[PDB]
């Protein structure tokens, strides 16, 4: 099997491309960074430091690379079995005309072997979003053929990969890659570390409501307590209790909503606490806490679980502490943190929280959050 | 009939709310800006300067307002026949928990009169996007009832409304408001100035490929020629020829793709040229040209029509001039224009264009654009 992966950044090299190459798939990266392209074509391999219990150095080999903006990438799309991405939303749109030209060429070459495309992005159903972009660049006369031969498979991915050698990358031991089984065309690939499900949204929300929720609250409370790193914060027993409790509160929602087994979910929470303890990552709380306006939005990792607890009459006291810690995040380098500070300064925490989150300013939850915010100054 | 409109900004007051109130609908605005809320509740009316052939002053009356973040807005959602928005993508998410709470209350009050929700946003199928946000905030036990009783109707809207009295607004005479007939629940409303179609995407693309394309190219070529305003630029016969020709080239694509009548489309192009001639707007080319990276993206108003001309073997020379003018846009106040300048400076126009647009750097169209770019310095 052959795969083309767009985005040879830390995620592409240390997680998605790594798993593809480790599976024995002939892997080509596509990128615009010439230094990374040349390094991959020069050495055909690189080292990934996989760190958690111990530091392991894994070697990824037999890889090569092409420019995402040239003609070779189009030729490859006409030949490979899988196309994956880890590029972010702006570049996810930019690669669409090359993918569309690739699909036209695939049809013109008479390659009817099923192709599956999997966007591995920090987005909900990113591959469906990519499909939208590809449709916007594909000729009408190719659309039927593409519907028949090409699967746009959504995924949910989770691996902590923080910021001489332009190819080395350090990643945590843990990873999760789950894809929607029902969208694949043809025989399902056997890629170790990739799991197929009929219920992708359950896993998307699990990750959002557990990993993202816990990680953010660890960062926000940690910064308030003067902790440098996620590890320092999670080993602080006062902070740990609130982080664990918030993931448990959000977990009761997931259990009710999706039917996850309670004992396995408890173990998944323990596994995430261990991930935060990683002694090799030295992940700055300021990095993890960045963009608090996004992280305080209605559909995101603090308000959505809270709305779930309201839906089911479940307890949210630790979530409320998390929201108050988020509201306290300050960073000179973060424009959202600046906007946040200015909004609370101008309108007060109650109006500010309502305006960012969409919670009614008169509500009991907003009342509870404002109390908690006041208590942390 | 009763309507609630979220977003009492220039678009809400001068276009969407104006048409609703002019139709005799009892209109309430929802916003977070207390000055605008108080002015609307104090005076219950305001003046809209409608300018084109002449300057007309219209009065909008019998309106009131509530906070989008309080409890009265929830009560209103349980009572009104229509909810409209003009808030932008960030606030479109933020209003979702209030809408969801409103729908729960609508069900709990036993109001089974059909409700239709229409987001009037500079987005493709914004109401479908809003629906996604509302679903993320609505209890599972309300979802069936909402599917039965509530329509989320996509729209395509077009009115040029550029930047003492906090309520007055100036708008061009022309407006267009088209909505997807097939998504309405119950009897269709009679709102003058709102048209219902089975084929909304045809109108979305028409506006993107004609108004947006023409308006952007007028701004970009105008700025290069030292013209202050859209009117100054469009009356420059050299610029006008390129703007008209680009809208015609994009128009041949729309005619082939959607079956628009060629004579009516020619007249629609003439109508847009007249809109650019408006002598009362004094619209700065720098404002209209802002965000060139967005405007040079694969799915946007310059590259998508170009891809269409490639699809159908149609002529794009004027589109190419437009792309080269966009690539020349400079503004200190515009971070994208800064990013653009830095990218061309670092990588050269060919690589820069390919990296922003997704066109193959080796392609003839990229070659043509680079020539044109070089010719304009
Ligand atoms: Na691995
Ligand atoms: Na295969
Ligand atoms: Na069980
Ligand atoms: Na309340
Ligand atoms: Na409450
Ligand atoms: Na009007
Ligand atoms: Na009605
Ligand atoms: Na005709
Ligand atoms: Na070519
Ligand atoms: Na070409």
From Swiss-Prot, chains A, B:
Record-listed E.C. numbers: 1.1.1.17
EC primary class: oxidoreductase
GO molecular function, one term: mannitol-1-phosphate 5-dehydrogenase activity
A single BP term in Gene Ontology: mannitol catabolic process
Modified-residue entries (N6-acetyllysine), positions: 264
UniProt catalytic activity: D-mannitol 1-phosphate + NAD(+) = beta-D-fructose 6-phosphate + NADH + H(+)
Disulfide-linked positions: none
Keywords, ordered alphabetically: Acetylation, NAD, Oxidoreductase
Gene3D superfamilies tied to this protein: N-(1-d-carboxylethyl)-l-norvaline Dehydrogenase, domain 2 (1.10.1040.10), NAD(P)-binding Rossmann-like Domain (3.40.50.720)
Superkingdom of origin organism: Bacteria
GO cellular component: cytosol
Family: Belongs to the mannitol dehydrogenase family.
Alphabetized PANTHER family for the sequence: ALTRONATE OXIDOREDUCTASE-RELATED (PTHR30524:SF0), MANNITOL-1-PHOSPHATE 5-DEHYDROGENASE (PTHR30524)
Full protein name: Mannitol-1-phosphate 5-dehydrogenase
Protein species of origin: Shigella flexneri
